[PDB]
Amino acid sequence: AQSRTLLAGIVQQQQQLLDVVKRQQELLRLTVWGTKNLQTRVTAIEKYLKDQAQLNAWGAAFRQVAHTTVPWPNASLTPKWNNETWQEWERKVDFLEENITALLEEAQIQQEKNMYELQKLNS
Amino acid sequence: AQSRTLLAGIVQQQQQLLDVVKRQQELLRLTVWGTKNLQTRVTAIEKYLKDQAQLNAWGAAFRQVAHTTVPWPNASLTPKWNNETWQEWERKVDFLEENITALLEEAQIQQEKNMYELQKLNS
Amino acid sequence: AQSRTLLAGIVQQQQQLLDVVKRQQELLRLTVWGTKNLQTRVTAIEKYLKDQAQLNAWGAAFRQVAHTTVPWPNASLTPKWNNETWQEWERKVDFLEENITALLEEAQIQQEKNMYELQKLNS
């Protein structure tokens, strides 16, 4: 009269949930690439903005033999506040990523063990 | 002496976990919109940067009847590397999204079946 | 002959899954900060682009005592479409975030209760 069948359905449900959790992790990795990729493009834009500062007043004088170039900074480059803050952000993700892999590894061993034990009941 | 009550709590716990997993999926969809929305804004910025290249030296000559316009590229437009790489990124998300929906659909049918069977034990 | 041990493994498996779900939430929060941080940088870029519009034709005249400044808009600032749409995006995240916390709180109470009941069976 033991409800082994009900347990089989319950154990199977946990397996499906674990698979979906893993799918979210891969999807999360894809999202991270999009954000990081945008930053690389943003850095390229910063270099072009500096070039615009170089353009100020050229050939604006035909009674003198000189050209005035004023490349005043345009894109404010982040030296310490963004890098130090961004590194902390990346480091937090690395610790959470390692923790999720350890938890998933333990779940896989326990999941198989629970199903293995179930088979012994009705092998 | 069967622990049907314990099973009821266990089955209910799986239902709550499934709901939270679905909530993460919707939240993930909202995050994707933010990243994609930023790219559309970035493209608008690229068009303005090209306009800046057009500004070089105008009216810088009152002893000639001509104007010099030098629209040298400014924003580096991505023709194949980003589009091909971004399409692969979007395609990977589409396959994972379809897989999560299939897994969730199966879980919903199994979850209801497990609860339905539980009701038969004590209906 | 009750499978209390199998239930202990099953109950433990749910606990591990709940922990991983919580880890995804924190990771999701870190991802949100990266996207929002980029927008703040984008606004800074918009201010510099306006400055470029100011640079048009200076000193381009040595037979006149005047300077022509033409600061034509460059970065298209979003007044209502992005803010209204972005506020809706942020609001949707706030409702989903509150819903996930409520579901997790209920799961923690049910999880402890299921384990507490298990202890009574074999305390």
Kindly tell me the sign of the dihedral angle through the C-alpha atoms of B32, C108, C2, B3.
negative
Q: Which chain C residues are within 8 Å of A21, Cβ to Cβ?
A: 17, 20-21, 24
DSSP string, C87-112: HHHHHHHHHHHHHHHHHHHHHHHHHH
Tell me which of C100, C108, C113, C119 to substitute to probe the interface with B (most B C-beta atoms closer than 10 Å). C100
Give exposure, B102-117, as e/b (b: 16+ Cβ within 10 Å): ebbeebeebbeebbeb
Domains of chain A in start order, with CATH, are: 1-123 (1.10.287.210)
**Residue C90: HSE in the Cβ half-sphere, 13 Å Cα cutoff:** 9
| Distance separating alpha carbons of residues C37 and B86, to the nearest angstrom | 22
**Which one, of A87, A93, A57, lies nearest residue A72 by Cα?**
A57
DSSP helix, strand, coil percent of chain B (3-state; round to 5): 75, 0, 25
| Distance separating alpha carbons of residues C31 and C52, to the nearest angstrom | 33
Q: Which residue has the tokens 């038969």?
A: B120
| Distance separating alpha carbons of residues B44 and B21, to the nearest angstrom | 36
Sequence-distant (≥ 6) Cβ neighbours of residue C103 within 8 angstroms: B16, B19, B20, B23
* Residue B49 host element (H or E): helix B4-54
For this PDB entry, the determination method is NMR
DSSP string, A58-76: SS--SSSS--B------S-
Sequence-distant (≥ 6) Cβ neighbours of residue B13 within 8 angstroms: C14, C107, C110, C111, C114
- Neighbours of A, requiring at least 3 CB pairs below 8 Å, are B, C
- Tell me whether residues C103 and B16 touch, CB distance under 8 A: yes
Beta partners for C57?
C68
CA distances from B54 to B61, B70, C52 (A): 17, 5, 12
- Tell me whether residues A103 and C58 touch, CB distance under 8 A: no
| Distance separating alpha carbons of residues A31 and B93, to the nearest angstrom | 9
Chain C positions touching chain A (beta carbons under 8 Å): 1-3, 5-6, 9-10, 12-14, 16-17, 19-21, 23-24, 26-28, 30-31, 33-35, 37-38, 41, 44-45, 48-49, 51-52, 55, 57-62
Q: Which chain B residues are within 8 Å of C39, Cβ to Cβ?
A: 38
- Tell me whether residues B14 and A19 touch, CB distance under 8 A: no
Contact B11, C119 (CB under 8 A): no
Contact B69, B51 (CB under 8 A): no
**Which one, of C80, C85, C79, C86, lies nearest residue C39 by Cα?**
C86
Kindly tell me the sign of the dihedral angle through the C-alpha atoms of B80, B82, B85, B86.
negative
| Distance separating alpha carbons of residues A89 and A39, to the nearest angstrom | 14
Q: Is C77 helix (H, G, I), strand (E, B) or coil?
A: coil
| Distance separating alpha carbons of residues B68 and B66, to the nearest angstrom | 7
CA distance B93 to chain A (A): 6
CA distances from A92 to A79, B20, B86, C27 (A): 21, 23, 26, 8
CA distances from B18 to B67, C22, C92, C100 (A): 68, 13, 20, 11
Contact B14, C115 (CB under 8 A): no
**Which one, of B50, B45, B57, B46, lies nearest residue B72 by Cα?**
B50
Residue B68 gets which letter from DSSP? B
Sequence-distant (≥ 6) Cβ neighbours of residue C93 within 8 angstroms: B27, B30, C32
Other CB atoms within 10 Å distance of the CB of residue A118: 20
What φ, ψ does residue B120 adopt, rounded to 5°?
A: -60, -40
| Distance separating alpha carbons of residues B83 and A39, to the nearest angstrom | 16
Contact C30, A95 (CB under 8 A): no
Side chain identity at residue C53, one-letter code: A
Side chain identity at residue B98, one-letter code: E
Kindly tell me the sign of the dihedral angle through the C-alpha atoms of C96, C97, C101, C104.
positive
What φ, ψ does residue C57 adopt, rounded to 5°?
A: -150, 100
